[PDB]
Amino acid sequence: LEVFNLATSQFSKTLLTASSKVFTQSLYTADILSIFGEVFLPHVMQPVS
Amino acid sequence: KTLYNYYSEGPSTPIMPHLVNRLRGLDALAKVDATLSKVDMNAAYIFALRPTFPYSYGYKQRFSNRRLTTSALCYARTGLSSFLTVDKTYTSNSPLKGGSRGWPIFNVGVSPHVAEPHMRTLSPIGLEVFNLATSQFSKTLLTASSKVFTQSLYTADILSIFGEVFLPHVMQPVSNYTPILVRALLALIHILGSGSGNCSLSSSIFESSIPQFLTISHSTNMSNRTRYCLHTWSAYKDMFRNGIPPQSTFPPTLAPEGSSARILIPAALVTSPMFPWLLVLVSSGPQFFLYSKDASINTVDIGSRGRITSPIPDVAHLDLHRLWNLFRFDGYRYIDVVIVGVDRDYVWPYQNGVYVHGGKGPKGTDNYENADVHDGIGTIFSSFNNNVNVQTSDLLLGLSTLWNHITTTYATEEEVTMAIKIAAAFALVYPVQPIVYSGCSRALYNHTSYFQPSSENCYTTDTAEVKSTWDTVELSVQVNNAMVLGMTLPFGQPTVSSAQWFNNIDKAEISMFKVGNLPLQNLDYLSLDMMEFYAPTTGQLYDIRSDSLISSAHRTVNLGIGYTALADFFAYLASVPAQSFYHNRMVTSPISKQAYSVYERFIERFIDDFVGWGRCDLFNLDTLLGAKRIAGVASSPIPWHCSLQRCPLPIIMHYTGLHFGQEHIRVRVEGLQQIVLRNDQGSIVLDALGTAAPSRLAVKLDWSRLSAWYSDTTCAIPISDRVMEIVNYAAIWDPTQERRATGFVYTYFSPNFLSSFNVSEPIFNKTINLTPPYD
């Protein structure tokens, strides 16, 4: 949802709502957000499977 | 409305409200009449930049008995699609077949007027910068900035940049992107080539299609170059610490100034292919010259009967200039490119040997301490280097990306429309107008000052088929100079500047008089949009559904031909003679200045009513009145009776609604006059019947009288003998002339040029049948 917000809105921040750095090497850091916004943008726009 | 509606209206009462409602409708038609995104790219370019204008011809005869005529279709086109000159390396002084010794330079200056900005909306980062500007610090004011993303545009440093060098725009967020859109449209049109496919003064030499490959040539003596200085943000900000140095670009810009500007470009966008095309289109131009890679495979020669000769005889020593070379734009003379978000080891990705101030230095060092100035866009951007060969698609990729991004993210539809309307004034280049002369009958030999038939500026080069008897021009040096000096833009303005690259010497003579002016692009808007300081105008990714590059260029060329046609119509209504736009327009007759005075009123009224831009930037009399009659070249003995007319009649009819159908030809009670002349020995020498030509007021009150006037004074032009049917039956009787009798003038096009009208598309290689249908 926050990746979608980054895709559809100009950056603020208030948009960083779910990501955290508490857990090391998890799937919830900012790097994973970058991965999602880079190589999975259409699925972010239209989530299907 | 539709094209069917407009073809059945005709001119009406006041003709200025007419011809502008028609133009707006025709422009609206061109927006939706063809989805060019579903065809091949070359086909789209052909269909956008070279429109066809179908029409049906035909003539009647007095006594027809089993006469067989073909009622076919023809497709009229106007304008030069490129220019053919002698090779830069060519030492002989012999005249080449179809190759001009030089070429015109349409030098455009800088408009003092400012493109009016319109309101924008702040981004959250910009909103917080605004809060910092208008409130005492708290904090609670830091609402959008973050340090999660490294080297992004959302840290506190970018806030400092905005509050330092863009404060007025923070206070009043506005932007206008019309001038860069104008330059982009012109770049596309001049690189590809708009018009009819004619590519020479010879009127019989055509280029088959868009070139596939281009060549870049540099010329120090002939280019119009901009100086560039590359800095990182830290190095650029550090040179203003100890006072203000000379030529400072630091202060913000509301009204752009031609000398010196700064652009702040994020590091992520420097590697975009649009970036060099961004540096071009705001700089001076041209900084390099563009040629078709080889002129043999594209150029053809067309016969009087439509015989295509593919390899023109002397193509080995000819250069095929793009229209890009015939134009000269004044932009910013000095640009400070400031890359934002880079370290002290930053490397210029383009041309080697180029070091960014505050970046990687020559040997191996960081924080380069020199701010080197590079003269010309070619000294950086190796893709613009001398003798570079490039596919046109690769060249245009950056332009298309730039246009798509700007028109979907930064600009509004109004800005794009204004850019189209302005660019249409410089979209096309036309050769000097050729005219013929019927002459006078033998019975009137003693009552005329112009007895013999004649022609002017009628040049052809094909030798395969029969040459037209009216095409008597031979291309000497002085005649070539005169013909180049007679070339015009859509609104009629010529040039008095020209260039020549002969032997091994390149030379340009640039007059202080300019054919027009263009506004500068405020680069602060560009910087702030590229740093996401504004909210985007739209969230769409693609302009295919709205205001694409090719659709915009098609609209621009459509409006440019419309400007040419309406200008010809105005010159007719203002009785502006064709000879007032020749190389010797100043030394021939005092009619020229009066005609300019009358014509400029029509032009300015139209420009204010339709374009809305300040007239003077699009048309003025500076180049007309600064004529340059060169050495000799005597004008042919033709009376000044035909108007300006750069377009064939069917195109003029399309844009004006003028109807010249066969129903206006009389075939069958007394409105004629018996005209009598006597000599000293009381002997009647004329005793002839005549009819009065209509006054322009009568035409104003009844536009069908102009149609009748066409059908009473027009004859089909013969090809092999200089005797028309008309001169055996009719003549012009002007009582206020010292000698009352003259013939007819008849703006001339050429059978070779008219053969190209025989196919729906401007493609002629070998399988095209240009022969007249059914003989």
Substitution target in A4, A8, A13, A22 with the highest count of B β-carbons within 10 Å is A13
Q: Chain A contact for B121, CB < 8 A?
A: no
Chain B contact for A10 (CB, 8 A cutoff): yes
Pairing of strands B106-110, B327-329: parallel
Q: Which chain A residues have a beta carbon less than 8 Å from that of B124?
A: 10-14
Cα separation of B37 and B44, whole Å? 7
CB-closest option in B146, B153, B535 to A13: B146
- Asked if B124 reaches chain A (Cβ–Cβ under 8 Å), the answer is yes
Q: What 8-state DSSP symbol labels residue B223?
A: -
Inter-chain touch A13–B532, beta carbons under 8 Å: no
Peptide bond into B286 cis (omega under 30): yes
Contact A12 B148 (CB under 8 A): no
What is the C-alpha to C-alpha distance for residues B556 and B93, in angstroms, rounded to an integer?
40
Supply B194's token pair. 């708009």
Residue with tokens 């025709």: B26
Measured between beta carbons, the chain A residues lying within 8 angstroms of B125 are 10-12
Considering only CA atoms, give the Rg of chain B: 29
| A36 contacts A44 by C-beta, under 8 angstroms | yes
Nearest CA in chain B to A12: B144
The CA dihedral of B197, B198, B204, B207, to the nearest 10 degrees, is: -50
Report which of B399, B385, B375 is spatially closest to residue B351, judged by C-alpha positions. Answer: B385
User: Who contacts B694 (Cβ-Cβ below 8 Å, separation ≥6)?
Assistant: B705, B706, B708, B709
Contacts of B609 (CB under 8 A, 6+ apart): B16, B20
Cα B504 from Cα B506, distance rounded (Å)? 7
Structural tokens at position B556: 């621009």
Sequence-distant (6+) residues with CB within 8 A of B199 are B80, B81, B82, B83, B84, B193, B205, B206, B207, B299, B320
B612: tokens are 């809305």
- Closest residue by Cα to residue B226 from B323, B322, B321, B328: B328
Distance from CA of B120 to the nearest CA of A (A): 15
Do A13 and B149 make contact, defined as CB atoms within 8 angstroms? no
Contact map slice: B 133-152 vs A, CB within 8 A: 143-146, 148-149, 152
| Helices B392-405, B549-573: crossing angle, 10 deg rounding | 90
Instruction: With beta carbons under 8 A apart, name residues in chain B contacting A14.
Output: 124, 143-144
Q: How far apart are CA B723 and CA B440, in angstroms?
A: 10
DSSP B165-181: H-HHHHHS-EE--HHHH
Write out chain B residues lying below 8 Å of A16, CB-based.
146, 148
The interface residues of chain B toward chain A in range 507-546, judged by CB-CB distance below 8 A, are 532, 535-536, 539
Ramachandran area for residue B403 (φ above 0: left; ψ -120 to 50: alpha; else beta): alpha
How far apart CA B525 and CA B409 sit, in angstroms, is 12
**Using CA atoms, how far apart are residues A29 and A19, in angstroms rounded to an integer?**
5
Q: Who among A8, A13, A30 is closest to B144 (CB)?
A: A13
C-alpha distances in angstroms, B283 versus B277, B330, B333, B637? 10, 7, 7, 46
Kindly report the nearest CA distance between residue B289 and chain A, in angstroms.
Answer: 39
- Using DSSP's 3-state secondary structure scheme, residue B732 falls into strand
Report the alpha-carbon distance of residue B382 to residue B350 in Å, rounded. Answer: 6
CB B130 within 8 A of CB B190: no
Q: How far apart are the C-alpha atoms of B485 and B100, rounded to whole Å?
A: 12
B388 part of contact set with chain A, CB < 8 Å: no
Rounded Cα–Cα distance for residues B716 and B422 (Å): 38
Note whether B144 contacts A12, CB cutoff 8 Å.
yes
Give me the DSSP letters along B78-144.
-SBSSEEEE-SS----SPPSS-BS-EE-EEEEE-SS-PPPEE--B-HHHHHHHHHHHS---SS---S
Q: C-alpha distances in angstroms, B85 versus B31, B39, B206, B212?
A: 36, 33, 14, 20
Size of interface A-B (CB pairs under 8 A): 34
How were these coordinates obtained?
cryo-EM
Interchain CB distance below 8 Å, A13 and B154: yes
**Residue B587, exposed/middle/buried by CB under 10 A (0-12, 13-18, 19+)?**
exposed
Residue of chain A whose alpha carbon sits nearest to that of B121:
A10
- Give the tokens for residue B530: 């590229």
**A23 touches B: beta carbon within 8 Å:** no
Q: Does B123 touch chain A (CB under 8 A)?
A: yes
Experimental structure resolution, Å: 2.1
Distance separating alpha carbons of residues B289 and B325, to the nearest angstrom? 6
Pairing between β-strand B261-266 and β-strand B334-340 as defined by DSSP bridges: parallel
Q: How far is B555 from chain A (nearest CA, A)?
A: 32
Burial letters for B674-706: b for 16+ Cβ neighbours within 10 Å, e otherwise? eeeeeeeeeeeebeeeeeeebeeeebbeebebb
Interatomic CA distance for residues B205 and B321, integer angstroms: 14
Sequence length of chain A is 49
CB contact under 8 A, B532 and A10: yes
**How many residues appear in chain B?**
775
Paired tokens of B701:
């009150």
Centroid of chain to Cα B6: 26
Inter-chain residue contact B144 with A16, CB threshold 8 Å: no
Q: Quick check: A14 contacting B, CB < 8 Å? A: yes
Q: Where are the alpha helices (DSSP H) in B297-353?
A: none
* CB-based contact B81:B300 (threshold 8 Å): no
In the block, residue with structure tokens 């280029």: B207
B146–A14 CB contact, under 8 Å: no
C-alpha to C-alpha distance for B216 and B425, rounded to whole angstroms:
26
